[PDB]
PDB file of C-alpha atoms in Angstrom:
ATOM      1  CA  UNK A   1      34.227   8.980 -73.579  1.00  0.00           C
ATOM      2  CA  UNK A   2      34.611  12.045 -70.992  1.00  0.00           C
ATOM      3  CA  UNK A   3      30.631  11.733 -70.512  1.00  0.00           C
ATOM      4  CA  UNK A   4      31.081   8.496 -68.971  1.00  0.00           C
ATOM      5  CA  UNK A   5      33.972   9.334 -66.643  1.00  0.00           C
ATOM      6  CA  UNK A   6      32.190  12.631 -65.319  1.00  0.00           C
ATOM      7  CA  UNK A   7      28.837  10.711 -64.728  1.00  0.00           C
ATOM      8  CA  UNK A   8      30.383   7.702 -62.926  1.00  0.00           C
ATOM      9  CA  UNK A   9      32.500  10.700 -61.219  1.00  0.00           C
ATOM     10  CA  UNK A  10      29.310  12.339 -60.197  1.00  0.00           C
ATOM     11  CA  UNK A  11      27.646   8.992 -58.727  1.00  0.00           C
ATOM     12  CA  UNK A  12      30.737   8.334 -57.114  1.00  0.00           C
ATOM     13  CA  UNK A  13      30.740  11.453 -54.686  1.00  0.00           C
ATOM     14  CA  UNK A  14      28.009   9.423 -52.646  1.00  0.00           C
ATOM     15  CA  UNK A  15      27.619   5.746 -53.954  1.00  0.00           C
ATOM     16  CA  UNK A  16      30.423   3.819 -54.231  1.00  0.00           C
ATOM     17  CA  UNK A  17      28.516   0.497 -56.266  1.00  0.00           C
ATOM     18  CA  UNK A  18      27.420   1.455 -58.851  1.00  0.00           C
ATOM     19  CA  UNK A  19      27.502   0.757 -63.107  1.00  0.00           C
ATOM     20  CA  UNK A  20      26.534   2.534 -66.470  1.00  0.00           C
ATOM     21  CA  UNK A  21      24.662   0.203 -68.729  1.00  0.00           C
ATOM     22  CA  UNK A  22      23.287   0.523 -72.410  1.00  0.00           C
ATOM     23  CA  UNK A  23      19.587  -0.816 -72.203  1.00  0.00           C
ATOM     24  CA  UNK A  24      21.363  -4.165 -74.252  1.00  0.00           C
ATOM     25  CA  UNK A  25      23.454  -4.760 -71.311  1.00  0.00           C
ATOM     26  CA  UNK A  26      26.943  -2.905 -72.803  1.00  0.00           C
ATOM     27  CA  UNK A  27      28.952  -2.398 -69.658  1.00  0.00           C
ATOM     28  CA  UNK A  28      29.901   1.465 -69.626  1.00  0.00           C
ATOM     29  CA  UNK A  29      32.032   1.840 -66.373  1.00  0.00           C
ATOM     30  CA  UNK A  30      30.956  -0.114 -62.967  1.00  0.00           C
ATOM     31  CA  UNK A  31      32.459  -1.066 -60.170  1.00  0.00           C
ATOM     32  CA  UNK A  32      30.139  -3.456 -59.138  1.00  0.00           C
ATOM     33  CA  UNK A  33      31.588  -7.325 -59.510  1.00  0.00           C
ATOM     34  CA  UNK A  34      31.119  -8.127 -63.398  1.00  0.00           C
ATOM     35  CA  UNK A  35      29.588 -11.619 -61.746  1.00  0.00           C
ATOM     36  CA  UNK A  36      26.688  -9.683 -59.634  1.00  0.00           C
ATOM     37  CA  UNK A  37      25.994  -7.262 -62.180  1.00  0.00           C
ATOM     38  CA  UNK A  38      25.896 -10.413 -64.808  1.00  0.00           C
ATOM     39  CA  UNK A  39      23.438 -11.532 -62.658  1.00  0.00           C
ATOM     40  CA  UNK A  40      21.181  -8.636 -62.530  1.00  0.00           C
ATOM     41  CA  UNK A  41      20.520  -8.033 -66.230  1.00  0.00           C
ATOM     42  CA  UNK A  42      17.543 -10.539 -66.995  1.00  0.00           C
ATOM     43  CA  UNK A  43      15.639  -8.398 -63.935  1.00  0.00           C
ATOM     44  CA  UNK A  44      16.267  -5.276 -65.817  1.00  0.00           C
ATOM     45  CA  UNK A  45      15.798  -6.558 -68.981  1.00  0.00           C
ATOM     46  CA  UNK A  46      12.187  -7.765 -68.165  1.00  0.00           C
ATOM     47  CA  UNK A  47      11.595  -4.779 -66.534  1.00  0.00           C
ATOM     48  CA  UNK A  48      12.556  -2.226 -69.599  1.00  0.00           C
ATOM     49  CA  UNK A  49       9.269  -3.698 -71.648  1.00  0.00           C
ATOM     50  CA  UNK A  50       6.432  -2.022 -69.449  1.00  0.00           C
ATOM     51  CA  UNK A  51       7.965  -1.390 -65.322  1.00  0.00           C
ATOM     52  CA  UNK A  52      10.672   1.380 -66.524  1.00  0.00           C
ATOM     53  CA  UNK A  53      10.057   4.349 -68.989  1.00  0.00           C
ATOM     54  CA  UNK A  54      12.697   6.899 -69.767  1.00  0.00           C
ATOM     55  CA  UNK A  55      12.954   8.953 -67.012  1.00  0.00           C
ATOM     56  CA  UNK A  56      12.021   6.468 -64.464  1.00  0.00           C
ATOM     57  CA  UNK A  57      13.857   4.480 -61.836  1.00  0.00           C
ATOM     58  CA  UNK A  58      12.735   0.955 -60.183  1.00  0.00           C
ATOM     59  CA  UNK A  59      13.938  -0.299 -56.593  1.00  0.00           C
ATOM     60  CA  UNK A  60      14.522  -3.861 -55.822  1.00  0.00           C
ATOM     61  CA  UNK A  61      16.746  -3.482 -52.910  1.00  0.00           C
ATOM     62  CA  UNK A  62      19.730  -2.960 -52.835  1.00  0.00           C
ATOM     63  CA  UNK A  63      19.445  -2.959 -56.504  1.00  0.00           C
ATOM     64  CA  UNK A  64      18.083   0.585 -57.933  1.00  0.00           C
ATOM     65  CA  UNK A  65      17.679   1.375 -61.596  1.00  0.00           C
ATOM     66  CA  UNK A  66      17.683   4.603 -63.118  1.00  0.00           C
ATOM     67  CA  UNK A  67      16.300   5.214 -66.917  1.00  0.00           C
ATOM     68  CA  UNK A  68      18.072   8.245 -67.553  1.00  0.00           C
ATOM     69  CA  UNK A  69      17.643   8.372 -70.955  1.00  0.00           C
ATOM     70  CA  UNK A  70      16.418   5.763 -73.924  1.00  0.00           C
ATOM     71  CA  UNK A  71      19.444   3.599 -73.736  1.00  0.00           C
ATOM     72  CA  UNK A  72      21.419   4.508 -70.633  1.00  0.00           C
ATOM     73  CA  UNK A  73      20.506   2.582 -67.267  1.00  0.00           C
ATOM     74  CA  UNK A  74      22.421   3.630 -63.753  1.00  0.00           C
ATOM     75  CA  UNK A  75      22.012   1.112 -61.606  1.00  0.00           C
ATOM     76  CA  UNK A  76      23.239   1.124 -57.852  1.00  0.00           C
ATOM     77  CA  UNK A  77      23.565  -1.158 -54.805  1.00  0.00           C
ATOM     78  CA  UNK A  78      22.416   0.829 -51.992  1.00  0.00           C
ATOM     79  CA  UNK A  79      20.451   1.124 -48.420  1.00  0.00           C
ATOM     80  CA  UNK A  80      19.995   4.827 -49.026  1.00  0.00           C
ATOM     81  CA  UNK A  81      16.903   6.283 -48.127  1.00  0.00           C
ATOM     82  CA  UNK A  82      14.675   6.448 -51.228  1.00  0.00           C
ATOM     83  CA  UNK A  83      14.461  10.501 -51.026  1.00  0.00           C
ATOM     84  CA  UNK A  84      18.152  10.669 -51.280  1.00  0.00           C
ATOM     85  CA  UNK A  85      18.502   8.495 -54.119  1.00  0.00           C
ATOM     86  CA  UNK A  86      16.100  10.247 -56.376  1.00  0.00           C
ATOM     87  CA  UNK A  87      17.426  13.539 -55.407  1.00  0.00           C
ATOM     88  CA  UNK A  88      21.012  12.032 -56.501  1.00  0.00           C
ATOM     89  CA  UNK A  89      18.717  10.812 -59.789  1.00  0.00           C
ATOM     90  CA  UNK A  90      17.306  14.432 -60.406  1.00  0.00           C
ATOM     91  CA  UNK A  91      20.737  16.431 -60.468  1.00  0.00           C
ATOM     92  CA  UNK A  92      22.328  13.292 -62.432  1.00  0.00           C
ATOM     93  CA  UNK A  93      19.887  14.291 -64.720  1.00  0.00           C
ATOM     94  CA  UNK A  94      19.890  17.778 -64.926  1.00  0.00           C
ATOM     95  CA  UNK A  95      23.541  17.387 -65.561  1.00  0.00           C
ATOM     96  CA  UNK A  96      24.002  14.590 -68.220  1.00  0.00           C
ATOM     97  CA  UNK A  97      21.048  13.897 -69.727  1.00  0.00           C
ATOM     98  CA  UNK A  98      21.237  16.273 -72.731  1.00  0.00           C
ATOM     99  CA  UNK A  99      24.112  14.835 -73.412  1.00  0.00           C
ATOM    100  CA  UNK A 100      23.817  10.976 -72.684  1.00  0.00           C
ATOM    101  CA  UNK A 101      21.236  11.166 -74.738  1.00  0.00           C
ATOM    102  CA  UNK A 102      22.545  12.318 -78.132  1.00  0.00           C
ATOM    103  CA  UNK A 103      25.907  10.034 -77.515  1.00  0.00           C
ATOM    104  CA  UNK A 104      23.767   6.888 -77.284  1.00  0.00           C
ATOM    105  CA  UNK A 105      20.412   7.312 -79.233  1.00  0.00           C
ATOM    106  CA  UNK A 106      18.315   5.020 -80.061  1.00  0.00           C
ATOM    107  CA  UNK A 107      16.805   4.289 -83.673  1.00  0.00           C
ATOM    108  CA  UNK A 108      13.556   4.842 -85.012  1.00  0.00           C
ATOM    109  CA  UNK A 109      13.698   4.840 -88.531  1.00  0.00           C
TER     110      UNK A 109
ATOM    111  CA  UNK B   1      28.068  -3.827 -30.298  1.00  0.00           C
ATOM    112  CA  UNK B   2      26.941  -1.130 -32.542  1.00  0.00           C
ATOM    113  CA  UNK B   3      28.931  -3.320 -35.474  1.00  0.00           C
ATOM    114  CA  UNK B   4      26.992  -6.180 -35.470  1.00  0.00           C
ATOM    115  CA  UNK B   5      23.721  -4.153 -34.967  1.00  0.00           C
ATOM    116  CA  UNK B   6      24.645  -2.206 -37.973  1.00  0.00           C
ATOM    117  CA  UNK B   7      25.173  -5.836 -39.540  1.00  0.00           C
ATOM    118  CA  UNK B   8      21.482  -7.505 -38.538  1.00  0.00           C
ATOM    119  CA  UNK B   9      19.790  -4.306 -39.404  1.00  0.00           C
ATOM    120  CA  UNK B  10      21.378  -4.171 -43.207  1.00  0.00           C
ATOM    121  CA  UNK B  11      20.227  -7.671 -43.796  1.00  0.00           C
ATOM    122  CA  UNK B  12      16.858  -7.412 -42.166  1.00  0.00           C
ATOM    123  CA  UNK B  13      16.246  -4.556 -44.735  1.00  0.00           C
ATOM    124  CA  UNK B  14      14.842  -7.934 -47.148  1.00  0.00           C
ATOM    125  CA  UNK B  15      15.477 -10.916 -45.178  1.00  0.00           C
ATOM    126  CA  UNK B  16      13.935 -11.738 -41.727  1.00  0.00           C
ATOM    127  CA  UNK B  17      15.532 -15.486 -41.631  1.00  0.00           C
ATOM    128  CA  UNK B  18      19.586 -15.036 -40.900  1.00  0.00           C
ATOM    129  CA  UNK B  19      22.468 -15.559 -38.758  1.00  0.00           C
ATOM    130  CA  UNK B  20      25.835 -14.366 -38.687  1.00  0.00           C
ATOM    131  CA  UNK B  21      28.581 -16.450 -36.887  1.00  0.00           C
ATOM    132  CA  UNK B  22      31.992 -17.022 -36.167  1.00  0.00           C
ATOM    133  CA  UNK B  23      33.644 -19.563 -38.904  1.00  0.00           C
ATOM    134  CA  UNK B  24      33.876 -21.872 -35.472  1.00  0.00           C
ATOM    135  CA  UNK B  25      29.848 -21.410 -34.961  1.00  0.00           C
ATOM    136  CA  UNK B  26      29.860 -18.846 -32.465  1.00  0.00           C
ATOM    137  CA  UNK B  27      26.645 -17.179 -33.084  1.00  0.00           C
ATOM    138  CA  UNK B  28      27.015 -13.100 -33.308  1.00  0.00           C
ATOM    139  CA  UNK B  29      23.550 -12.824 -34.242  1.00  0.00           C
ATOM    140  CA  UNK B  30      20.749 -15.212 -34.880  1.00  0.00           C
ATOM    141  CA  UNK B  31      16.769 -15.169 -35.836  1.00  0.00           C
ATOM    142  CA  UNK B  32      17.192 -19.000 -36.790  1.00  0.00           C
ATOM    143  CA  UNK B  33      16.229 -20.789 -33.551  1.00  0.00           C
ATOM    144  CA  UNK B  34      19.193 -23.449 -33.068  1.00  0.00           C
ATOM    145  CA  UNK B  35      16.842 -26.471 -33.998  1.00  0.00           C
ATOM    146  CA  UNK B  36      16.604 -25.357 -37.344  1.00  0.00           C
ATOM    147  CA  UNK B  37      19.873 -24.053 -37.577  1.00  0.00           C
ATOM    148  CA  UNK B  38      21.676 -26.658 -36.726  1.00  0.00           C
ATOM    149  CA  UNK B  39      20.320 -28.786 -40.287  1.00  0.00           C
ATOM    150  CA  UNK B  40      22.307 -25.950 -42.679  1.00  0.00           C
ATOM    151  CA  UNK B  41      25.829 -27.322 -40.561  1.00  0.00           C
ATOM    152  CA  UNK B  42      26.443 -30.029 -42.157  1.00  0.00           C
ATOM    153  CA  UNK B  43      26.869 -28.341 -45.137  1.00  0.00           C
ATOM    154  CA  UNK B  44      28.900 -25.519 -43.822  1.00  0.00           C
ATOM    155  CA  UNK B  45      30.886 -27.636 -41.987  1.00  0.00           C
ATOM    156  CA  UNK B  46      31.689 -29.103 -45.657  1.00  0.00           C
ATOM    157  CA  UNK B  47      32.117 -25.796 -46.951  1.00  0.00           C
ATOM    158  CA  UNK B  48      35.052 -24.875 -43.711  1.00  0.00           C
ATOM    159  CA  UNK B  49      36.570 -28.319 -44.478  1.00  0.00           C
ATOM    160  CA  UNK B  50      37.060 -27.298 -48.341  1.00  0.00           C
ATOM    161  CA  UNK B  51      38.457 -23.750 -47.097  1.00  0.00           C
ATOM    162  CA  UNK B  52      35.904 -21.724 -49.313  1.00  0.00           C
ATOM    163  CA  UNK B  53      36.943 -18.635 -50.167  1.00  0.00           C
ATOM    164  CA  UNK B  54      36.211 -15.390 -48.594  1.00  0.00           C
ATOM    165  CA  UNK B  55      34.106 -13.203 -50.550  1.00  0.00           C
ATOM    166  CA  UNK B  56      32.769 -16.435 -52.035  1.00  0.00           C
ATOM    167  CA  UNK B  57      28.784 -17.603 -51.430  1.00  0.00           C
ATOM    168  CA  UNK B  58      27.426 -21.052 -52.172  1.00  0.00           C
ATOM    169  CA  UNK B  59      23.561 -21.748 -52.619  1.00  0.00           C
ATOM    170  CA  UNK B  60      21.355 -24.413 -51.643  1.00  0.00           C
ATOM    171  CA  UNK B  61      18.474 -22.883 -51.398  1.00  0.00           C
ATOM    172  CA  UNK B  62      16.585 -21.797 -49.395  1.00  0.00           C
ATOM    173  CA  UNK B  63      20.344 -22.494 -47.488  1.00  0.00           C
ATOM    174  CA  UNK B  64      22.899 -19.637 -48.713  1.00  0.00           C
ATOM    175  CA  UNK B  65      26.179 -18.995 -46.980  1.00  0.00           C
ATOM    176  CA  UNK B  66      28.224 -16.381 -47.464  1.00  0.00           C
ATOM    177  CA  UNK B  67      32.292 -15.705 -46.234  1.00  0.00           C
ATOM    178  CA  UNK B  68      32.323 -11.995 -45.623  1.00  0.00           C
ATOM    179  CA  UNK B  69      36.095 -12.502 -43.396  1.00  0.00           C
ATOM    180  CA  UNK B  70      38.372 -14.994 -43.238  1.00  0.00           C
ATOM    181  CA  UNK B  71      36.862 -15.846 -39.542  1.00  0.00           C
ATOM    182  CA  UNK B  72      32.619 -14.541 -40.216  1.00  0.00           C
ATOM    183  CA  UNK B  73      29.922 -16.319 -41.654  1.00  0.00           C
ATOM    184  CA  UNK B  74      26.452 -14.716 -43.223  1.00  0.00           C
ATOM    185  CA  UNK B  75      24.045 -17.676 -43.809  1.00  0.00           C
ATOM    186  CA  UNK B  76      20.186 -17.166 -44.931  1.00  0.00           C
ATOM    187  CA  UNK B  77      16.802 -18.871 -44.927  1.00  0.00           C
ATOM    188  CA  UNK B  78      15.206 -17.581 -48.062  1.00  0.00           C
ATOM    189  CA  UNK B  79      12.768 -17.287 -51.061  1.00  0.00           C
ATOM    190  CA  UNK B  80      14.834 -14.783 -52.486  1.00  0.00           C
ATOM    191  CA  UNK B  81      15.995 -15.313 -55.929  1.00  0.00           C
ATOM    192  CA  UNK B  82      20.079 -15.840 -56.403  1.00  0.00           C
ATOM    193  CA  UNK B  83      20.537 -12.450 -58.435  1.00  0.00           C
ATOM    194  CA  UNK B  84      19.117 -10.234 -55.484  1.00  0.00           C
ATOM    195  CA  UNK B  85      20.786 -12.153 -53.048  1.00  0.00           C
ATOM    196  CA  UNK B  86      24.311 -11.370 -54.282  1.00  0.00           C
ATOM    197  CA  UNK B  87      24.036  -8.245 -54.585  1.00  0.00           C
ATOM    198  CA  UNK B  88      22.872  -7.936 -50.961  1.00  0.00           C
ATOM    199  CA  UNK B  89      26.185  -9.502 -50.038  1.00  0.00           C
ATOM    200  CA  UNK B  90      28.528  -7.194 -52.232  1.00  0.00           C
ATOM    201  CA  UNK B  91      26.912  -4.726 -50.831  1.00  0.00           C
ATOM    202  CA  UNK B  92      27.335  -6.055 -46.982  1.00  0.00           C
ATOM    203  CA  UNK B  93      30.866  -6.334 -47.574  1.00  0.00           C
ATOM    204  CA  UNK B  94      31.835  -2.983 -49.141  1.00  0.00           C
ATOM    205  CA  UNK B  95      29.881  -1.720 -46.048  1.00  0.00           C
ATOM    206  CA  UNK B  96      30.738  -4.205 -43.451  1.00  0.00           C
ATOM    207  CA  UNK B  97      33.781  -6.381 -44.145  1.00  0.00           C
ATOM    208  CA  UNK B  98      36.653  -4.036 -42.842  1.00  0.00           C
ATOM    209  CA  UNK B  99      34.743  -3.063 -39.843  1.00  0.00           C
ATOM    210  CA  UNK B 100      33.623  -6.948 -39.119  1.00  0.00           C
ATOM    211  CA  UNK B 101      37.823  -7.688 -39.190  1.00  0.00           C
ATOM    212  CA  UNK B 102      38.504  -5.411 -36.822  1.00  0.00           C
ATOM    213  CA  UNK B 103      35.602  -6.053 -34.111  1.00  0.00           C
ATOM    214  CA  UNK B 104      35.936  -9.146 -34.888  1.00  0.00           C
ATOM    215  CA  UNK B 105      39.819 -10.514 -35.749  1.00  0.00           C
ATOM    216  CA  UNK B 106      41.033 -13.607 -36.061  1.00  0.00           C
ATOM    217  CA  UNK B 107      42.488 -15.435 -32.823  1.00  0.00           C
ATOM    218  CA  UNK B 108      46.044 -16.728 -33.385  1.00  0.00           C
ATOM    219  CA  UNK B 109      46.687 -17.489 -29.683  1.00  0.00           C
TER     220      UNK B 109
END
């Protein structure tokens, strides 16, 4: 939905690889190769069980992951310095998390 | 110049074992010595032969070669695990590839 176009718009002011992942690996927008980011998932998958709470991010260069909320993952191909990536992280944040996080909750119950 | 400086210091981010040549051999920039260089050409010479793609990559590790141009070749020495390594390469070529065609062009006389 418009969420999705105005955070991949956001990331897209400064990084132009990027994607917006569910934590199953559901494709959101990304315009990294659909090959490479195949490729990518079992690292992120491993590293969801203990390496990458909500709110956390995890650099294996040039891959970055960001845990925004439960379910939704950014994840970039960059040489950025780290400082400017998290700062790009923080105001991602600030901006969608509130709502990222009540389109694509996660289940408790 | 600058280019290929810009190039060698991208990759050597993660990997200290590369070179980048010409598709002819011409080495642009090398920390393989030429003694154990020389063992990865038979199978790029294989690779020219069967006109692989640019933007393509084909493993043999710790061998990987990669066609960023028509006319430039990225190969690598490395423990570095397929999924890492192709994203290093998308990401050289969104960064790289233009500027490697035009210090770089093909020679048609």
């Amino acid at each position: 939905g418009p969420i999705i176009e105005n955070c991949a718009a956001f990331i897209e002011k400064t990084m132009s690889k990027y994607a917006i992942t569910l934590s199953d690996g559901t494709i959101l927008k990304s315009t990294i190769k659909n090959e490479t980011l195949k490729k990518t998932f079992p690292i992120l998958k491993n590293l969801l069980k203990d390496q990458i709470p909500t709110g956390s991010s995890f650099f294996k260069l040039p891959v970055v992951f960001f845990r925004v909320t439960d379910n939704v993952i950014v994840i970039l191909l960059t040489n950025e310095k780290e400082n400017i990536i998290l700062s790009m992280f923080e105001l991602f944040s600030t901006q969608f998390a509130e709502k990222l996080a009540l389109e694509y909750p996660r289940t408790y119950e």
